[PDB]
Amino acid sequence: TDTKIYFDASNLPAEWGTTKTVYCHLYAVAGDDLPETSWQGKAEKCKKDTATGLYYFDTAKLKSADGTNHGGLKDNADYAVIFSTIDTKSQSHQTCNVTLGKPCLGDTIYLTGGTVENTEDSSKRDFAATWKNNSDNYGPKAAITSLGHVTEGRFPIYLSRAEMVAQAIFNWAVKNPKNYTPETVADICAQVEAEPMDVYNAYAEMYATELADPAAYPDCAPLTTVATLLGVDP
Ligand SMILES: OC[C@H]1O[C@H](O[C@H]2[C@H](O)[C@@H](O)[C@@H](O[C@H]3[C@H](O)[C@@H](O)[C@@H](O)O[C@@H]3CO)O[C@@H]2CO)[C@H](O)[C@@H](O)[C@@H]1O
Ligand SMILES: [Cl-]
Ligand SMILES: [Zn+2]
């Protein structure tokens, strides 16, 4: 019945300093059109439970694009969540990505110890975190990073391995070509168990609209680049 998820901000590492504000970055990976919230913006702000000291975020208050209530998490969808803070020195801290499903509603994310490569920023490591009661089926989300590394954790159910690699190439091949080399893309395929030609076909279908208008979408690698990175001849 509880549509809230909770964050244990007690006994944080010294690096986190004194928590001032807590934020929840909850997003769909596959099977939902959930709008993404601005990182550490108003829509992400978590309330403090003054009784328990836990912070919480109500998934029942997630908004759709038309500003109405989204009607909660969907059953046949992959979600991921990050809890973050701004400390009394205005410095940001965050958990890694943790997989999220309906069984996790009413449960608490806590820091496990250890850090992991930030997905966006090679200068940063996030803090390993998982669910208190749902770690059997949910936990750290395996992510393809800005460097083309595949982080520790679980893979999605409703996003194919080929689609995951296609999305990484779409995200990073133009932005970070010194990392997104043919060697790196071969390594990604090996780590996520995707067939390169499946990645090429997935990319071509997924990003057809952007591929048709390079002038408008310059961060979308053209098919010729994607074929070269995957070592395939289409
Ligand atoms: O929205 C989906 C997206 O969410 C997560 O990305 C967030 C990062 O985890 C978070 O750190 C932040 O990234 C910023 C860096 O902290 C900052 O140093 C600098 O590099 O800018 C980054 C933003 O470009 O915000 C993003 C969300 O925008 C998740 O990790 C991703 O895998 C996921 O795709
Ligand atoms: Cl890792
Ligand atoms: Zn790495």
Numbering used by the authors: 34 to 267
Task: Provide passages from the article that reported this PDB entry.
Ruminococcus bromii is a keystone species in the human gut that has the rare ability to degrade dietary resistant starch (RS). This bacterium secretes a suite of starch-active proteins that work together within larger complexes called amylosomes that allow R. bromii to bind and degrade RS. Starch adherence system protein 20 (Sas20) is one of the more abundant proteins assembled within amylosomes, but little could be predicted about its molecular features based on amino acid sequence. Here, we performed a structure–function analysis of Sas20 and determined that it features two discrete starch-binding domains separated by a flexible linker.
